[PDB]
C-alpha cells in the first residue's frame, strides 16, 4: 500500500534534499521543480503516492526554447526542427563566400536559461 523511493525524472528534480527515507506513507505528495533546460507546463508539479503503492504524476515540464539567433550576413540560418532545448540549427554561405566558424549550433543550458552552443560563423571572401 505504501511507496518506495520515487523514480528519477529526466525533466525535473525534487525540491528539498531530504533524507529520502526509503519509504513513504500512502498519499504523500512530493514537490518538484523543472530541471535546467526545462519550463513549467502544468499547474501540479508533484508525484503522489497512490493507494497501490505507486508514484503518480504527469509530465509537468517542457523544453525551454532559445531566442532565434538572427541573420547570417551573406548567409542562411536553417532551422531543422525547432529552437527547443536539444535542437540544432545549420549555417551556410552564399555562392561567393567561405564559411568560417561552425556549420551548426545547438540550443543548450546557459546561465539559468538556455542559449546557443556555438557563435554564428562568418561568411567571407
Amino acid at each position: 500500500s505504501n511507496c518506495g523511493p520515487p523514480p528519477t525524472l529526466s525533466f525535473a528534480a525534487p525540491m528539498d534534499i531530504t533524507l529520502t527515507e526509503t519509504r513513504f506513507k500512502t498519499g504523500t505528495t512530493l514537490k518538484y521543480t523543472c530541471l535546467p533546460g526545462y519550463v513549467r507546463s502544468h499547474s501540479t508539479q508533484t508525484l503522489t503516492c497512490n493507494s497501490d503503492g505507486e508514484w503518480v504524476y504527469n509530465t509537468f515540464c517542457i523544453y525551454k526554447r532559445c531566442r532565434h539567433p538572427g541573420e547570417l550576413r551573406n548567409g542562411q540560418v536553417e532551422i531543422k526542427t525547432d529552437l527547443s532545448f536539444g535542437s540544432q540549427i545549420e549555417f551556410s554561405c552564399s555562392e561567393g563566400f567561405f564559411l568560417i566558424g561552425s556549420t551548426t549550433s545547438r540550443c543548450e543550458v546557459q546561465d539559468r536559461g538556455v542559449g546557443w552552443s556555438h557563435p554564428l560563423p562568418q561568411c567571407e571572401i
Binding site: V39, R40, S41, H42, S43, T44, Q45, I62, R65, C66, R67, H68, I79, D82, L83
Partner: protein
C-alpha cells in the same frame, strides 16, 4: 502589413514562458489562500 517571419518561433517561446509564469501565479495564490 507584414507577414510574420519564421518568428512565429520567438512568439511560441514567449507564450510558453508566459504560461509558465501563470502557473507560478496560480499555485502561489492557491497556497497562501489555503
Amino acid at each position: 502589413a507584414k507577414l510574420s517571419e519564421a518568428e512565429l518561433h520567438d512568439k511560441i517561446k514567449n507564450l510558453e514562458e508566459e504560461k509558465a509564469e501563470l502557473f507560478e501565479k496560480l499555485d502561489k495564490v492557491e497556497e497562501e489562500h489555503k
